[PDB]
Write an enzyme that holds these catalytic residues in place. Sequence first.
Site, mmCIF file in Angstrom:
data_model
loop_
_atom_site.group_PDB
_atom_site.id
_atom_site.type_symbol
_atom_site.label_atom_id
_atom_site.label_comp_id
_atom_site.label_asym_id
_atom_site.label_seq_id
_atom_site.Cartn_x
_atom_site.Cartn_y
_atom_site.Cartn_z
ATOM 1 N N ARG A 185 -1.840 -2.598 -6.601
ATOM 2 C CA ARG A 185 -2.151 -3.826 -5.864
ATOM 3 C C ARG A 185 -2.882 -4.808 -6.772
ATOM 4 O O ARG A 185 -2.390 -5.912 -7.042
ATOM 5 C CB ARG A 185 -3.052 -3.541 -4.674
ATOM 6 C CG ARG A 185 -2.441 -2.673 -3.641
ATOM 7 C CD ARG A 185 -1.854 -3.480 -2.520
ATOM 8 N NE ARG A 185 -2.856 -3.984 -1.583
ATOM 9 C CZ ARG A 185 -2.552 -4.451 -0.373
ATOM 10 N NH1 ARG A 185 -1.285 -4.469 0.036
ATOM 11 N NH2 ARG A 185 -3.508 -4.913 0.422
ATOM 12 N N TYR A 243 -9.730 -7.262 -4.971
ATOM 13 C CA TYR A 243 -8.549 -7.230 -5.798
ATOM 14 C C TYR A 243 -8.524 -8.121 -7.028
ATOM 15 O O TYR A 243 -7.561 -8.849 -7.239
ATOM 16 C CB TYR A 243 -7.352 -7.510 -4.905
ATOM 17 C CG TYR A 243 -7.189 -6.438 -3.862
ATOM 18 C CD1 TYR A 243 -7.998 -6.407 -2.725
ATOM 19 C CD2 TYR A 243 -6.275 -5.399 -4.044
ATOM 20 C CE1 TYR A 243 -7.900 -5.357 -1.793
ATOM 21 C CE2 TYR A 243 -6.171 -4.343 -3.120
ATOM 22 C CZ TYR A 243 -6.991 -4.333 -2.003
ATOM 23 O OH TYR A 243 -6.918 -3.287 -1.119
ATOM 24 N N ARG A 249 0.835 -1.185 0.000
ATOM 25 C CA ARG A 249 0.000 0.000 0.000
ATOM 26 C C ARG A 249 0.879 1.246 0.000
ATOM 27 O O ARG A 249 2.020 1.205 0.469
ATOM 28 C CB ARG A 249 -0.907 -0.001 1.233
ATOM 29 C CG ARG A 249 -1.779 -1.218 1.373
ATOM 30 C CD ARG A 249 -2.926 -0.893 2.302
ATOM 31 N NE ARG A 249 -3.885 -1.987 2.430
ATOM 32 C CZ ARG A 249 -3.797 -2.971 3.322
ATOM 33 N NH1 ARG A 249 -2.791 -3.013 4.193
ATOM 34 N NH2 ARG A 249 -4.715 -3.925 3.331
ATOM 35 N N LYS A 252 -3.413 -1.171 8.289
ATOM 36 C CA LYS A 252 -4.822 -1.505 8.462
ATOM 37 C C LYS A 252 -5.107 -2.658 9.398
ATOM 38 O O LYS A 252 -6.233 -3.138 9.445
ATOM 39 C CB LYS A 252 -5.462 -1.831 7.119
ATOM 40 C CG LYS A 252 -6.069 -0.669 6.383
ATOM 41 C CD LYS A 252 -6.744 -1.201 5.131
ATOM 42 C CE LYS A 252 -7.700 -0.201 4.509
ATOM 43 N NZ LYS A 252 -8.504 -0.843 3.443
ATOM 44 N N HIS A 256 -4.127 -10.173 4.246
ATOM 45 C CA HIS A 256 -5.474 -10.219 4.775
ATOM 46 C C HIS A 256 -5.616 -11.243 5.884
ATOM 47 O O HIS A 256 -4.930 -12.266 5.875
ATOM 48 C CB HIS A 256 -6.432 -10.607 3.660
ATOM 49 C CG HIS A 256 -6.538 -9.597 2.573
ATOM 50 N ND1 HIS A 256 -7.353 -9.778 1.478
ATOM 51 C CD2 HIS A 256 -5.974 -8.377 2.434
ATOM 52 C CE1 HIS A 256 -7.289 -8.705 0.712
ATOM 53 N NE2 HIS A 256 -6.461 -7.841 1.270
#
Lengths: 531, 531
Positions: free
Chosen positions: B380, B422, B272, B297, B413
């Site tokens: 990404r 994505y 990111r 995040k 994730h």
Amino acid sequence: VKIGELINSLVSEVEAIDASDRPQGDKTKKIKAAALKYKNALFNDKRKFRGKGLEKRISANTFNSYMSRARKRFDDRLHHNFEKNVIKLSEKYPLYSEELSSWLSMPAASIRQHMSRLQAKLKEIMPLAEDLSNIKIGTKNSEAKINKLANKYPEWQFAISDLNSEDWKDKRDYLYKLFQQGSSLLEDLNNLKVNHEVLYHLQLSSAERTSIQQRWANVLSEKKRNVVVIDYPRYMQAIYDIINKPIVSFDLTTRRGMAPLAFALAALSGRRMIEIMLQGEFSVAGKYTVTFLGQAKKRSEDKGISRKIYTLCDATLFVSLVNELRSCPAAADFDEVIKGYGENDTRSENGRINAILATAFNPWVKTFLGDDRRVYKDSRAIYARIAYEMFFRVDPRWKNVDEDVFFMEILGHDDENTQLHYKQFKLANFSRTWRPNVGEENARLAALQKLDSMMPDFARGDAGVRIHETVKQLVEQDPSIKITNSTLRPFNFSTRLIPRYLEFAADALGQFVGENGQWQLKDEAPAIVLP
Amino acid sequence: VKIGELINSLVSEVEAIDASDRPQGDKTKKIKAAALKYKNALFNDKRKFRGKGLEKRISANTFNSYMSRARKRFDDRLHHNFEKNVIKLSEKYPLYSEELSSWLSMPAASIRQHMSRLQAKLKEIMPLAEDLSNIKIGTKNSEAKINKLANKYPEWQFAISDLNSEDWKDKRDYLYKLFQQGSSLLEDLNNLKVNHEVLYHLQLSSAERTSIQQRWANVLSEKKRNVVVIDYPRYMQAIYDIINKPIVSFDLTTRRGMAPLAFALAALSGRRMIEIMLQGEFSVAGKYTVTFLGQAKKRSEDKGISRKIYTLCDATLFVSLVNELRSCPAAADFDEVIKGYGENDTRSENGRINAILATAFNPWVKTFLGDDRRVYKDSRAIYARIAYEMFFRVDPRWKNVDEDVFFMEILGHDDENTQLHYKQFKLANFSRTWRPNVGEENARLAALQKLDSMMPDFARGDAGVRIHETVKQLVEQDPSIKITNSTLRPFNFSTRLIPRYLEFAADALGQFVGENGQWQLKDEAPAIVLP
DNA sequence: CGCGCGTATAATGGGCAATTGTGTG
DNA sequence: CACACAATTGCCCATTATA
DNA sequence: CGCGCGTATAATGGGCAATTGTGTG
DNA sequence: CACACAATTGCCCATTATA
């Protein structure tokens, strides 16, 4: 009962019957609610809460499955305080009193459908208004933007497209009235209790729910970290070989008999067992595409929508094998099996079916594929991989959509989320160009090499060749048949002679004796490639 | 303020300051709660509820973003009735009083972490007990099963493995005590209120939440039905061409200057923006793999875990360009930019960064890729596609795992669910074997063809060739540079002469005049293949 | 299998001041 | 070369959109 | 991006009765 | 051929596991 844990059925009704009087009673609301909870803890405990040891109570899975059951028993019944309420909202919100009031005298089964549809429509206000709160209400760009946006929000086109027309101002201020009213309606429609009061007590418990929900979450996770590789051509072949055997070729007077064919049809289309065996409806659409209706597991949309699906062999041949299977004996009881066995059968009609076929099919499948570990419903997982590897980059249907959309639509899912369960398989040796085989025959050939050679002198006169001839004739038929003592006796050969023969033809027939009778050595490398 | 809608900052504190006294007051609980709600509706309305017109109020997105802000302002503060409660549970459940009581005097920031960890541990009781309620407690198969299952449920191994040992019965009955107690603890830990009372009123509203949540749901759906095809080699090339220009080759005294390089680094690793620009930490691991720390995040796990990620070019060269960029001028303010501008800056440190870079980078990106529609964070989506098409079937790392696991792990994730965002890109012309280029030069060559040819007589004496020579020299340098009137004046050529030249060299330099100054005709086919 | 929720980043545009660009006096 | 005036960069923030 | 919930199918094993299998009287 | 006894099929249901 015999080996049962909970007399479920009785129980379930012991309450639907009790809580049907509890609401019938002359006493009123305040206490009634007090007694309903009562009833539930009566149901709830009986199954998994109080007065239950440990290794003798049912499982969280069996508990939530049974809850669903009890709950579902009230489907057609709405909250006592419901109608009372719907009225209050008609009064409270006018522009929506036609729809709100059109509910009242209607089946619950369709109020629920009318309310979510309305909720859906209302939930689109927020965005729609924000889009407008960014549009010049004047006739400079209105015509365009409006007819573009208005045609973008369906159940509003009537009040949107009516902005840049015979009218202007007044018809606009109108919307804001539909907005400020529908916006607070929703706030209230969401909070409004619909289903029967009991349901709110027939719930598991944060503790119980949370830990089940995590367990499941864990089970499917370990699953995505444990793929099972399949040999495309071996698999495909074995399937095509099932499809060919003329319908008569195999027994269909037994529930198990239709396993091979059932699993095959399912393996070629990717439909669910029930869909194939009972409520599925197909009609050809092309060489490899067929139209389908009767998607299962849909929480009634009401709609009998059709989806175009892939077929891994002539879609025509496909629709006929399904029309075939659905007939042959083993499948005729279905109209009665469904009706259940009494007032204590809590299963669903589809469930009643599962009660029969599931046991008949899965066992076959394991043998069929080699290892045990996996089951029938693997046809889906498999199919979906093939269909993908086979048509994603080719059918111009998915030009502008991602793989997830693909798995979703091909599966009939209402969201690209649930297709995360269908990716446990990986294909080894895949070719968009695979083709079946004509044939050879290891079996007869081998038995042949020992033909006359040693058959006239294998016994007293004839016998030697008459048995061998028979066995040959018998194999040429079914190059995969198991010749046992029972296979040859109906032909009338000296009982103390058949086994004498089998011990001999042992290697040509490819059979060995295990810890019991005679068996057949494993053939090839089971579609499931080892680790 | 100038063009602001809500004086946010003031507002946000107008309450954290108010609700900090409201709990300070001598009055007690009953009323305090009564006043807190009060405070909120004060906050809530000011932003989107009452006394607000229509086209002048903020959006549901701006509303939930700002709510998050206010809520977050209390992070370090737990419910008034909390501690009171934790005690009650210690008393209520003994076997868990060491942990429960070890909370009390501790930061909220870590109680929350201790509670979910405990909830997690407790939520595993249900299954673990069911597994045992199917295990012969005797020393026949215990040793095996136990040491297999016990080693399968970590924070229990201490009480599980201690079943088949120096002890037996008594140590077993022990567990059931850990079970019956932890099982009901959870039921209570789940219901226990943790975060400050205010939070329960700083929520949107079913109406508002539901309709946002559906909107978003819709936006990402239309997205999966609208893929954008990228030209692998063109793209890859343009990227490699950025990576080569020596660090000095480009301006880094401006925020925009570092756009090309920033987007590139991000395009090669898939990290990111913030991760690249600020808190990311890498160290080589192989030619194409690098280890990463500082995943953004994450709702604090606390842990500074590292994940091995792919790199689309020499991972060493990669880590150096990141160490480079992070230095050059434009990126040095960062230690101060973070501190904010005052007590009214509600942004996060990371947010403060986004306030700067986002505007500097996105504009470059659009030009860079051709069309506008897509942005920076596309690196990404792109990357993840490459990495997939590039290493899924090859790196023996994913032998037994499905694509979703892949996208997940490569993205960092915490669940294979979020990787559904994505997958908007499809690669056209991908090869695991692509390679960059050495070079040619359309530009200088063309300008060359009109070299001497017409340069001695293009003007009064020298000029003709001195300008052309300059322009050539200037292009050979940057085969992609835009020669304008300002590019040549610093060299000192008759002002009424430069433009006379540009109009001439117009086609060799590949420039045309638009509705203003001179521009450069589009080069190739922008990585984004048209529909 | 289908239905629901609060947070941590990235992206867009406005209003200015600085710099690139054009003519040309 | 220097000056007047047209555009475009570059900036940072408050909004707004996405994972 | 990370955290949560009730329903509609498919799968497994038990306890029997029927049929396949083996020897052999 | 017929009879005694070993296994394996086949069945349907109540549980239990998955989408």
